[PDB]
Each structure stands twice: as C-alpha cells, then as structure tokens.
Amino acid sequence: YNKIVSHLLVAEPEKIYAMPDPTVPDSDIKALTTLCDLADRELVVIIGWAKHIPGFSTLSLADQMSLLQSAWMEILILGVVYRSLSFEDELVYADDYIMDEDQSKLAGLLDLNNAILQLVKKYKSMKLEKEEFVTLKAIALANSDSMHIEDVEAVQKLQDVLHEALQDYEAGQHMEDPRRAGKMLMTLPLLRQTSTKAVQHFYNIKLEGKVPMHKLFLEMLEAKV
Amino acid sequence: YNKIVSHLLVAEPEKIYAMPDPTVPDSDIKALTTLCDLADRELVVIIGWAKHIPGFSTLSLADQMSLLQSAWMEILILGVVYRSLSFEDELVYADDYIMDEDQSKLAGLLDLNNAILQLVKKYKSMKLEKEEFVTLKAIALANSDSMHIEDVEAVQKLQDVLHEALQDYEAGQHMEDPRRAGKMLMTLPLLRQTSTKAVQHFYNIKLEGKVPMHKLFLEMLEAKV
Ligand SMILES: Oc1ccc2c(c1)CCCC2
Numbered sequence: 108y109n110k111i112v113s114h115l116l117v118a119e120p121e122k123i124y125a126m127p128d129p130t131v132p133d134s135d136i137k138a139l140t141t142l143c144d145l146a147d148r149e150l151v152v153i154i155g156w157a158k159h160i161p162g163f164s165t166l167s168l169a170d171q172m173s174l175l176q177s178a179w180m181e182i183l184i185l186g187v188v189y190r191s192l193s194f195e196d197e198l199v200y201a202d203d204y205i206m207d208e209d210q211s212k213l214a215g216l217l218d219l220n221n222a223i224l225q226l227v228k229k230y231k232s233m234k235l236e237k238e239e240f241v242t243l244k245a246i247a248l249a250n251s252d253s254m255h256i257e258d259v260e261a262v263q264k265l266q267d268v269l270h271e272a273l274q275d276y277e278a279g280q281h282m283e284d285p286r287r288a289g290k291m292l293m294t295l296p297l298l299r300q301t302s303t304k305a306v307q308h309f310y311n312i313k314l315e316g317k318v319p320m321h322k323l324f325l326e327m328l329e330a331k332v
Numbered sequence: 333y334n335k336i337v338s339h340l341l342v343a344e345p346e347k348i349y350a351m352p353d354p355t356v357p358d359s360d361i362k363a364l365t366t367l368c369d370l371a372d373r374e375l376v377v378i379i380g381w382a383k384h385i386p387g388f389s390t391l392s393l394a395d396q397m398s399l400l401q402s403a404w405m406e407i408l409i410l411g412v413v414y415r416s417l418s419f420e421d422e423l424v425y426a427d428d429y430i431m432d433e434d435q436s437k438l439a440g441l442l443d444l445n446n447a448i449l450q451l452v453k454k455y456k457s458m459k460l461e462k463e464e465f466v467t468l469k470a471i472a473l474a475n476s477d478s479m480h481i482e483d484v485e486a487v488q489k490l491q492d493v494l495h496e497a498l499q500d501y502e503a504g505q506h507m508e509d510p511r512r513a514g515k516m517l518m519t520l521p522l523l524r525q526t527s528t529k530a531v532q533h534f535y536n537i538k539l540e541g542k543v544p545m546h547k548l549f550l551e552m553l554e555a556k557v
C-alpha cells in the first residue's frame with residue numbers, strides 16, 4: 108500500500124518503560140511524577156521520530172518547534188490510546204504502567220483518563236489499525252494549528268502530503284467504506300479536546316509545585332500557556 | 333449539486349440583531365450581557381434549524397438534546413466566523429454588533445476573539461463557501477462527541493449522511509482539489525478548541541454573577557460542566 112504509511116510504520120519508535128520507583132510509597136505525587144517523567148522521555152523520542160516525516164526536517168527549526176509545541180500532547184495521548192485498544196477500561200501508559208479506574212482516582216486523573224477512554228472506545232469501534240494510528244499521529248503534528256508558523260504554505264503542504272497518504276491508504280485497503288478516511292479525520296476534534304484537558308491539568312500541577320518535572324516536559328507545558 | 337447541501341442552504345436561518353441597549357453605558361458588563369442575550373436567541377433558532385437536518389428529528393429527544401448540548405457553541409462560533417469572512421480583524425457577531433480589537437479588550441474577550449479570528453483566517457485562505465459552512469455546521473452537530481448518546485449507531489449514521497454530502501459536494505464542485513473535503517474536516521479541531529475556550533470563559537462569567545443570563549443559554553452552559 109501507500110509508501111508514506113509504510114515509512115511511518117517502520118519509523119515507529121520502540122515502546123519505553125515507565126519504571127515507577129519501587130522504593131517510593133504509592134501516592135498521587137508518585138503517580139504524577141511517574142507520568143511526567145515518562146512523558147519527558149517520550150518527548151525526546153517524538154522529536155527524533157518527527158525527522159522521519161517527509162518534509163518535516165526541511166521546515167525551519169522555528170516551524171518544527173512550533174508544530175511540536177502545539178501537537179506534543181495529542182501525540183502522547185494517541186500513543187496511550189493505541190496501546191490501550193486491546194484492554195477494557197484501562198490505560199496502558201506503558202507496559203509496566205497500566206491505569207485502571209481506582210488508580211486514576213488515586214492520581215487525581217479520573218476525568219482526564221475517562222476522556223482518553225472515550226477516544227479508545229471510538230477507535231475500538233472503528234477497528235483502528237497501526238497504519239492509521241501512525242498516519243494520524245503525523246497528521247495531528249502537521250494540523251496542530253500553531254499561531255506562530257513562519258512558512259504557512261510549507262506547513263499546508265505537509266498537511267496535504269499526510270492527508271493524501273491517509274486517503275490513498277483507505278482507498279486501497281478499505282474499499283468497503285469510501286468514507287473511512289474522513290471518519291478517521293473526524294476523530295481529531297476529540298483528540299484535540301482531550302489534549303487541551305490534559306495540558307490544562309498538568310499545567311495546574313506544574314503551578315502547585317508538588318510534582319517535580321524535567322526540562323523538556325516543562326518547556327512543552329510552558330510553550331502552551 | 334448535492335441535495336443535502338441545497339437543503340441545508342434553504343434551511344439557513346435569517347440573521348438576527350444584537351440590539352445593544354442604547355440607554356446603558358458602554359462597559360464590559362453591557363458587552364457581555366449583549367452577547368449572552370444574542371446567543372440565547374440564536375440558540376432558539378439553532379434548535380429549530382436542526383429539525384431540518386435529515387434524520388435529526390427521528391433521533392430520540394434525549395439524543396437530540398445531547399447533540400445540541402455538546403455542539404451549541406461550535407455552531408454559534410461557526411456563524412460569527414462565516415459572517416466575518418469579508419471583514420479584517422473584526423468579528424461580526426451581528427450586523428449591528430461588530431467587535432474590533434479595542435472592543436474585545438473592553439469586554440475581556442481579546443483572547444477568545446483572537447482565537448475566533450484564527451478560524452476566520454484559515455477559512456479565508458480556503459475560500460469557504462456558504463454551501464460548505466452550512467454543511468460543516470451540521471457535521472459539527474452530529475460529530476459533537478457527547479458522552480450521553482443512547483442510539484450510537486443512529487448518530488453515526490447521521491454523521492455519515494452529512495459527511496457523504498460534503499464529500500459529494502466537493503467531488504462535484506471542486507475537482508481541482510481532490511482533498512478539499514478532508515481539508516474542510518481538518519478545520520474541525522480548531523473549531524472544537526475555540527468552542528471549549530468560549531464555554532469555559534462564559535461559564536466563569538456565569539459564576540461571577542455580574543452578567544445576567546437567560547434560561548436556555550444557562551441550560552446549555554450548565555449541560556457542559
Ligand atoms: O504516553 C504518555 C505518557 C505520559 C502522559 C501521557 C501520555 C498523557 C497524559 C499526560 C501524561
């Protein structure tokens with residue numbers, strides 16, 4: 108099938124481990140510290156992954172950073188969603204960090220995680236494929252609506268290249284549903300909505316000052332408010 | 333062209349006037365009171381308009397209300413956006429209520445209105461047509477991601493019917509761009525993002541208690557938090 112899709116598939120990063128500190132007592136602070144540390148390491152991986160998206164590295168450094176600073180949480184959330192598709196009412200933040208309802212309550216994350224589970228529910232019913240997941244991650248990055256873009260036409264071109272990939276993939280692989288590509292695009296509003304909820308929640312956690320956060324995660328959280 | 337599109341066009345409501353009270357001194361409270369009163373009357377019109385969308389009235393009353401309670405602010409914002417396309421850096425909330433940057437500052441709405449102007453900017457560059465605007469309003473209603481839907485399959489059918497209308501419209505009217513339908517769908521995340529910003533802002537205004545609000549607007553604001 109479509110080459111961009113195959114390319115994004117082979118560029119997909121390996122999963123990483125959350126490694127919650129086994130010497131630390133379980134608490135909301137430990138859960139939030141674990142999650143923010145995991146996100147920080149995933150953001151390094153995301154920055155490396157984006158260089159494989161056709162045309163991304165040719166943008167200016169400022170436009171590359173603007174796209175990432177707008178889209179980073181959507182990309183993180185799409186990952187948890189995809190890893191959680193074979194599960195029921197649990198979120199696989201990592202293989203060693205699977206959050207059920209009780210854990211979400213303990214972390215203060217019941218509302219955020221229920222919103223993520225709504226994304227999971229919809230993708231389950233659509234039978235989201237890995238091919239579609241990796242293409243949607245790239246589309247979310249290109250379509251992230253940053254206010255600070257320099258070369259608007261080159262970013263529009265990146266959106267078009269990735270949108271064409273999804274269109275071509277669905278036309279070849281899913282002839283039974285001539286509207287599947289659009290159905291996939293129509294899941295992007297709920298992704299944006301959930302990401303905004305997550306950014307606001309963790310920005311408040313940042314302000315409260317009780318959860319330590321690393322440099323990159325803080326810089327992404329700060330580029331967004 | 334497509335019959336659903338033509339139908340939504342002829343079902344389009346007439347514009348209404350804001351009628352800011354000429355006896356009241358200009359202030360943030362007057363501006364916010366004027367806007368909330370205008371939105372309340374538009375919501376009555378929106379409820380009547382939705383009955384013309386194929387299949388909407390056959391949903392249950394609860395599903396009809398759930399869709400409207402999720403989508404109402406996106407529909408309101410799409411209207412201001414469309415009315416503002418021929419303007420520059422001003423928002424035509426109504427023919428008699430056009431907000432420039434100074435007025436937005438006075439109302440406490442500079443950030444919200446700048447976000448709406450970002451939607452306007454994108455639709456300007458795409459040369460958004462009235463046909464596309466009315467179809468996107470209906471798609472936003474059907475795709476509003478309510479957590480409380482009873483007949484999920486009938487709502488998915490409504491989404492598909494409206495999505496097919498946009499696809500068919502663009503395939504017939506815009507052969508020069510085989511990805512225009514998807515481009516239109518890809519504007520929906522920023523619409524959802526801006527609507528969430530507006531709902532949160534006016535919910536805070538509701539809590540502060542200094543701006544009087546009418547029953548329907550309050551009930552839509554309360555169904556969302
Ligand atoms: O893959 C990850 C890792 C951490 C976090 C998310 C996704 C999203 C919610 C914020 C925490």
Ligand SMILES: Oc1ccc2c(c1)CCCC2
Binds near residue numbers: 370425530
């Ligand atoms: O057509 C309208 C009328 C009033 C309002 C909006 C749209 C949206 C922002 C909240 C106020």
